[PDB]
């Protein structure tokens, strides 16, 4: 295909036509391009880069070439995390929280790659997550709201070829990374678009100032895109609630929903987010957004409104969270040392529970008994471990000693001379 | 004053012969060097320092012209803290619980210009700061320990004299440093001797690598002293116990040697401290040490032992913590927005506190509701401003409305987008 001399150019570091792009991308979209081109070309832009005009095309280019649904109600709301904290399952409260208002928000999300639990298989555990396109207007317009499985349609198909070839490559220029958080939005082609980040370390984006340069990418492509967006920085120091994994995390999402009563981590950060979408959408005034979305999911509005989607969704409605299943095999720790808990570490978080099998297995995952600061005295449960087989509880088990996730230290730090 | 001359050696960077060190300390506590030749001297150290040997040699001599004291009981114990941390009423509650082992424990303490209250200062609180040098071996042996302000006695007079220089001047070189700090000791020419060295920042170690440097210094010159010490690294990253300001503290360091419950950051440090001298005085095998020093200030040996003291001091036992006197007028500052605390500047709460003009009124100070990870709902009491005299309050206030001493973030800590 000359669509490879295209490929070449960038190479050789030129900027591309639309012309230039839609080929590639429309060959990619095609089959034309195998994976020796695609990642030629994937390697080619960490290598040279994107400026923006370049990845609004292709934002739009890789979005057109894809299924897109027309939602009659108006306006579009979306939200969607950067990603990177564990423990995520805000935004299952946020759809609810911003849909009462009665504003659209049709939500999609992908099984994680390299998390322990996609949104997408936590909803799975209490509502079937994977629905034809056509199926997805319905939804929304019927209940005004939805959270399916991305994947299972076809939209931006161009990234999930392309995608095979950053993890494998091991590498996630950001010039793709904005085409596909994007355009997939646009072929869903939602008005208003809200980006949340977790900030920390541990976490995708470690540095707020690496993360404010985000934002503007966001926000300015948006423009691009004619979407009215705008990014959350997000407190990224710990896994969100104190539970991770799908079962787990529905466990603790409904529950917090019903209650309306949750752990500061999910009730804060889901109705902050929410309150920010409700200012977009216009229902709030600016400043009232917090508001509104407490006073939405502490209601009981909110729970209401989810149940609408687990019913649309195939799940039953009435389900109380309390018996939903959970690994037999369980491990628990000990706290090794009085004291308080210096830090928890996110990354080790996600891989103990996905050692686990998480998310491949939902009743794997981990509950935390603690939050950093939280005092300790030797013995207090730090976390607890749940698997659907012995050989995984023991792996994560040797995982999780090596990795000491929970840090607990003393006002002596160190002691010096014995 | 010929030791003009060896001070100009100093400047062109060649090591000095004990009867050099000697000759200028001589001449520095005589008198015959005045301001000029100390600053000039002083300059020297910073600029080329000195090697152990020197400060080794130096501490002595600053310490031999000084009265010194020698103790019938023995082992000799002294528990010294670098400083920097605000609030640390933490010696109190060691030196007590040291004593209960019946170990020897003489202190020293020096109201310190910079900090809020001296540890002499919140003792005086309670009961007389200041005896002759030869009251306090009777003091201490009718006891075996005490708390009185080095300040009276003639202790390193040269120290003293530098000091203005180097405050002067804005230098602490270390090698001076360490003299002033160990040389004092060694005039109690204490057997055993402990140092704190709260880490974090605000305090005067910001790093904790910067500490075990120190350390090596500190134990090592020790050696040289042929005296045992032991340096812990501390936590400072936030005010130690919940009040600041001598009464304040003083309320709060009596009512936990009474009730042997009391705020957690003061309680675990004191055991925790006092530990290293229990297991260093050999009273407790190694590892026993924090235990037997929370069992005996459990067991409330360590505030009767205080009691002791106090009599001995001319404070009264049968005195009621709770009576103690605070600033009539006071203003508290309410929770600007929902949130948890991020953080607290310990350096802005001393001038915070220092406003309200402690320790010239014992009554001014800082009390706090709050800590670290500590969820704060919007309203809730961060911090109360105690003061004897209104200009002075308002003074603080204003002070306190720059800094904004404890901070309160969200999830959501930036919006970008409007």
Same mark, same amino acid.
């Not at 979306?78 to 935004?91: A, L, R, Y």
């Not at 977009?280 to 939405?296: F, L, N, R, S, Y």
């Given at each position: ?39 030629? !070309? ?119 070829? &392309? ?58 492509? +948006? ?40 752990? +500061? ?84 978080? &996600? ?31 730090? !976390? ?18 090596? &990795? ?15």
């Amino acid at each position: 295909p000359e669509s490879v001399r295209y490929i070449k150019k960038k190479m050789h570091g030129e900027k591309l036509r639309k012309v230039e792009i839609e080929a590639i991308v429309r060959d990619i979209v095609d089959r034309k391009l195998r994976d020796i081109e695609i990642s030629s !070309f994937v390697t080619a832009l960490e290598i040279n880069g994107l400026d923006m005009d370049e990845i609004a095309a292709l934002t739009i280019a890789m979005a057109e070439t894809g299924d897109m649904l027309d939602i009659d109600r108006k306006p579009i709301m979306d939200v969607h995390s950067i990603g990177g904290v564990p423990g995520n399952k805000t935004n299952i409260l946020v759809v609810p929280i911003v849909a009462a208002a009665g504003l659209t928000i049709p939500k999609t999300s992908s099984r994680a790659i390299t998390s322990a639990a996609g949104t997408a298989d936590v909803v799975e555990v209490f509502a079937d997550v994977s629905f034809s396109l056509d199926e997805i207007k319905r939804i929304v317009e019927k209940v005004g709201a939805c959270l399916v499985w991305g994947g299972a349609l076809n939209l931006a198909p161009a990234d999930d070829i &392309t995608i095979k070839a950053e993890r494998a490559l091991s590498i996630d220029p950001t010039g793709l990374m904005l085409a596909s958080i994007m355009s997939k939005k646009y072929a869903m082609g939602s008005q208003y678009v809200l980006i949340d980040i977790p900030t920390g370390k541990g976490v995708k984006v470690e540095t707020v100032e690496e993360a404010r340069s985000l934002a503007r990418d966001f926000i300015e492509l +948006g423009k691009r895109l004619g979407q009215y967006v705008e990014v959350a920085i997000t407190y990224g120091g710990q896994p969100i609630g104190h539970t991770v994994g799908p079962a787990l995390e529905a466990r603790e999402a409904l529950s917090a929903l019903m209650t309306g009563k949750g752990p +500061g981590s999910l009730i804060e950060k889901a109705t902050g987010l929410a309150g920010i979408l409700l200012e977009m959408g216009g229902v709030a005034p600016a400043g009232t957004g917090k508001k509104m979305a407490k006073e939405i999911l502490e209601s009981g509005k909110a729970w209401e409104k989810m149940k609408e989607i687990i019913e649309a969704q195939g799940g039953d409605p009435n389900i109380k969270p309390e018996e939903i299943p959970i690994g037999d095999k369980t491990y628990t720790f000990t706290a090794a040392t009085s004291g308080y808990v210096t830090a928890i570490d996110n990354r080790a978080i &996600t891989a103990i529970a996905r050692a686990a099998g998480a998310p491949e297995d939902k009743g794997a995952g981990i509950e935390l008994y603690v939050k950093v600061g939280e005092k300790v005295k030797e013995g207090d449960p730090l !976390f607890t471990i749940h698997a659907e087989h012995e050989a995984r509880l023991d792996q994560a088990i040797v995982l999780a000693r090596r &990795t000491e996730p929970i840090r607990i230290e003393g006002m002596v730090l160190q002691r010096i001379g014995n």
